[PDB]
């Protein structure tokens with residue numbers, strides 16, 4: 368055994384081709400074993416890759432649709448933080464056993480998210496092994512248009528999209544035995560947290576607009592403090608966070624205690640939100656942008672002389 | 684846990700940067716979290732992806748250097764069969780435990796092969812999980828220059844590079860208890876087979892020249908019959924193989940019986956040779972090419988009216 372199945376053999380090939388037929392930058396005919404891709408000549412390519420392993424990056428009971436969604440969402444969130452326009456991706460699936468129905472359901476979730484951001488699956492592998500999903504996503508950026516982590520400026524405001532800590536809250540409730548991840552619950556606050564863990568929303572549209580407003584950006588996937596820490600270190604500045612200002616969802620505040628909710632918001636994994644810095648005179652414009660996107664953008668802190676990320680004045 | 688480590692955090696980042704510094708199509712500075720890639724404007728990109736899983740695609744005792752070599756070799760062999768020029772790749776490593784020395788040795792093998800074909804590692808992931816290595820390789824082709832599986836012509840000769848069945852022979856000897864894969868042996872024929880399994884040679888240089896000579900091509904990784912089968916099916920022709928003509932190495936003939944060696948050559952996994960078809964009047968030129976490349980090219984059969992791959996006249 369150990370055969371590698373590339374394109375044409377993919378269980379998803381019909382849905383793959385349906386999407387390449389409507390893309391003038393992808394040549395993939397019925398009788399084609401690999402796609403020919405046409406980059407934009409004056410743009411640059413950026414490439415991200417992430418592997419999600421069963422039991423590590425998702426609880427084993429996570430359903431196929433949610434695995435398909437989240438595997439792509441991680442990569443799209445990476446591309447968002449660079450302000451890159453998603454173009455193409457590959458998918459390398461390791462499965463212990465053939466399961467036609469599982470792959471179809473995985474494809475449901477993958478394409479549900481992929482279609483929203485016009486990223487086209489154009490190749491990959493299906494082979495035997497412990498359940499592991501590796502996605503490589505390719506995006507494009509105009510010259511000098513990429514967002515970076517090293518360009519925060521003294522006096523900048525710090526901003527973050529969406530809400531922080533929901534996924535960590537769902538994970539904690541699941542570990543305490545209070546939340547089933549494999550089925551939908553009618554209890555609205557639990558279901559909200561469940562879907563923030565299972566189906567994070569990559570802020571691609573925001574990322575594509577931030578170049579016009581922001582100085583530096585990072586995606587928040589290892590917790591706000593860790594990821595803002597990359598901005599502070601790469602930019603050679605201090606970052607100050609006002610913990611009271613953090614955007615905390617209704618459900619997180621309702622279902623977790625004050626301290627646990629705060630810890631989730633500051634240090635929780637897997638938010639897949641965007642944290643960025645902007646000149647103070649962008650405040651009006653960023654509030655307008657949040658309304659335009661129907662996406663919360665919350666001013667949470669400031670960039671200042673010194674080093675390290677601070678919470679309420681303390682960097683220790 | 685479950686953190687994803689991308690570029691800048693890679694244990695291999697110093698060797699990565701040493702190689703991007705000498706590539707004018709890759710922008711990756713010391714203070715850069717992701718590379719910007721510049722495609723050739725008039726060329727098309729093709730992308731391949733393969734995952735190798737411990738115990739599945741390589742015996743668990745395979746050493747780190749050989750895992751690094753073979754993981755890339757699979758992808759380069761895919762690119763070779765398309766006549767694509769390798770450009771860039773990503774590497775997504777799942778490791779059960781941090782091991783600095785293992786990753787360094789893996790990098791030795793990866794870069795040993797990558798440097799020979801001027802393919803640059805430009806990103807990827809390192810994360811926790813059962814040992815699994817997923818590589819995405821990006822190559823480029825001029826307009827209409829890609830080799831294809833569907834263009835064999837009636838009357839073509841069938842050709843194959845190198846030798847067939849060595850890797851399968853080593854695997855059989857290992858399964859019978861006669862070959863240790865984790866250490867070098869001084870016994871020359873065993874060592875030859877061992878390295879054909881552990882370190883296959885992707886025929887990239889051949890692939891880049893075949894467009895000038897060949898009609899159709901495929902890489903042989905699931906055995907000659909399976910892979911030539913793709914040419915026959917996609918081209919709507921019969922392929923006839925003369926089994927007596929197959930290139931069988933000294934070591935394979937010496938260490939396996941006549942029947943086992945024949946079965947390895949016809950159906951053995953993991954040769955990573957190239958099988959192609961060419962007009963009969965290319966015979967002189969292809970012998971000259973083999974001399975030029977110091978690479979055996981062996982005429983093994985013919986394309987004819989009918990369907991399916993035949994051995995000594997039989998397609999059953």
Ligand code: NA
Nearest residue numbers: 387388390393
């Ligand atoms: Na198309």
Ligand code: NA
Nearest residue numbers: 703704706709
């Ligand atoms: Na360079």
